[PDB]
Amino acid sequence: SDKPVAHVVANPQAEGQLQWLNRRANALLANGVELRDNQLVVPSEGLYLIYSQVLFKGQGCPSTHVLLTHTISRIAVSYQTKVNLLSAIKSPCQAKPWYEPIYLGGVFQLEKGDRLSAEINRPDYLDFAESGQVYFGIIAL
Amino acid sequence: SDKPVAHVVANPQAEGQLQWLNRRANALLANGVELRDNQLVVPSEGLYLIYSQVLFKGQGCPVLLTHTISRIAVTKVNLLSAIKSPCQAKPWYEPIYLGGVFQLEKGDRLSAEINRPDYLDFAESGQVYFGIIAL
Amino acid sequence: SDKPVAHVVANPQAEGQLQWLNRLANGVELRDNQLVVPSEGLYLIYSQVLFKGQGCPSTHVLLTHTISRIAVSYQTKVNLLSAIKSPCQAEAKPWYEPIYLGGVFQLEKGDRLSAEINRPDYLDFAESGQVYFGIIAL
């Protein structure tokens, strides 16, 4: 004990970005995890549960189809290795509103100093109507 | 173990509601967590892993499905929320998952809610639950 | 002696099965494709499975994932956690559908937990950090 954990939420006031915040109520950084250049920094080696959710919302279907992506990536200290951990793609269009959440999660072996990022392609479709709809977090097992 | 924990399941005999049940097998409340007015009451300050799952089931497409966990510290403030559009007479199944690590205080009341209990699927045990685990 | 724990992963060479591979701490033994509880207590049970299909054959494509308890006292299979998914809602596009399961349960010495799927033909042994099963004693 005690286990490194983090749960960061998107800043709804940050236009055209997916900006992670830990300095708002119901968001945290604990036992060594850090938020640096919009990335979570792993404090110690071990098995981590990495999780993320983004809610996309559009107002109808415009010309052809829109692609929505959400990716979690890991940049390591050794060899500055840039690996891609979890990724998902969605085509919401096939004027009434649509809602498309993207979930990303898994158990990974991480090392001290690994920097994890949770990114999207279209921040214009990001939904911040209410709180708790878009978050990113890691839990040490 | 001294760690406060809870794993509550939906009552399949509750009409048009998502009613959490604790003492109805494989479900529990431990080390101070109490189930009051369909809310889990946090017994002590600390880091908690909050989790939830709801399974929605419809028969064809005639619709928005939502599932929210909210905190009321000692008006609800959403911790975790998700929205799903299952319709874009074959049946559809749509699970909604909610979870994360939160800093909670003694007396905080957590609720796990849905907008349409008519689409809720509890035909099988283990298909709709809500719990908290102290870290 | 400290805290029984386990994290198993699907065997990528076992085609047509969800076979859990070992390498399991402080007594949590994977005995018959099942995790065997070594002592009484509160356990956090977790699981994930990734499904992948090549297109849509019909809307009758049902995907399930279930964690079951076979209690050492009664000896009957009961669902602890379960979830169902309908991935199918021309040049067929591949689809990916993960299923997540987890919770805190009171388990007894000898209890056997299994993590099963209905269609192993749709299982995607490619992501790895995505098809797993584990328990952590609290």
Ligand SMILES: c1ccc(Cn2cnc3ccccc32)cc1
């Ligand atoms: C406890 C309750 C539920 C869960 C659900 N869960 C299982 N693997 C996951 C990966 C990412 C996010 C959630 C995940 C885990 C632990």
Ligand SMILES: c1ccc(Cn2cnc3ccccc32)cc1
């Ligand atoms: C992916 C899958 C599930 C989720 C939401 N989620 C449900 N149980 C969880 C337990 C721990 C963390 C996240 C969890 C988010 C992203």
